[PDB]
RNA sequence: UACCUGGUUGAUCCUGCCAGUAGCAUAUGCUUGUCUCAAAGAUUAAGCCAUGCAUGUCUAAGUACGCACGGCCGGUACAGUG
C-alpha cells in the first residue's frame, strides 16, 4: 500500500496569510530515482568485473 | 683610496698607549620646505593587562513540517528562498 496519503499534514492558519496545510518530505521512501541509483551500482560492479 | 696626525724631552730617536679620524647601530640635542621608498615595545620586564576584534564554514548534489517569507492551478510526500 501507498504511503504518501497518510502523511499526517499540519494546517497553517495565520492571520493576514491564505491557509494551507505543510506535509514533510517522506524519507526512506522507494522512488524511481533510488532504484536508478541502486541499478546503476550494480552496473558499475558489472562493468568493472567485464 | 693598501693613508695616518697631536701628546713623555731643554731638544732627539724609539717603545708605547691616550687622544684625534671614517663608517655603522641605538639613544638624545638643535633644526626641518618638496617628494619616493621604508624600520618601528627586540635590548630593561617570556612583566602585568581593562575593552573590542583576531576562525569559521552550504552546494544542483547530507538532514527543512520554523508560514520566516512565499507558490502557478496547489491539501501532488517533498514548489521555492531560508
Given at each position: 500500500?501507498?504511503?504518501?496519503?497518510?502523511?499526517?499534514?499540519?494546517?497553517l492558519?495565520?492571520?493576514?496569510?491564505?491557509?494551507?496545510?505543510?506535509?514533510?518530505?517522506?524519507?526512506?521512501?522507494?522512488?524511481?530515482?533510488?532504484?536508478?541509483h541502486?541499478?546503476?551500482?550494480?552496473?558499475?560492479?558489472?562493468?568493472?568485473?567485464?
Amino acid at each position: 500500500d501507498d504511503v504518501r496519503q497518510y502523511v499526517v499534514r499540519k494546517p497553517l492558519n495565520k492571520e493576514g496569510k491564505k491557509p494551507r496545510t505543510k506535509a514533510p518530505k517522506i524519507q526512506r521512501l522507494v522512488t524511481p530515482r533510488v532504484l536508478q541509483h541502486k541499478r546503476r551500482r550494480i552496473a558499475l560492479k558489472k562493468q568493472r568485473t567485464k
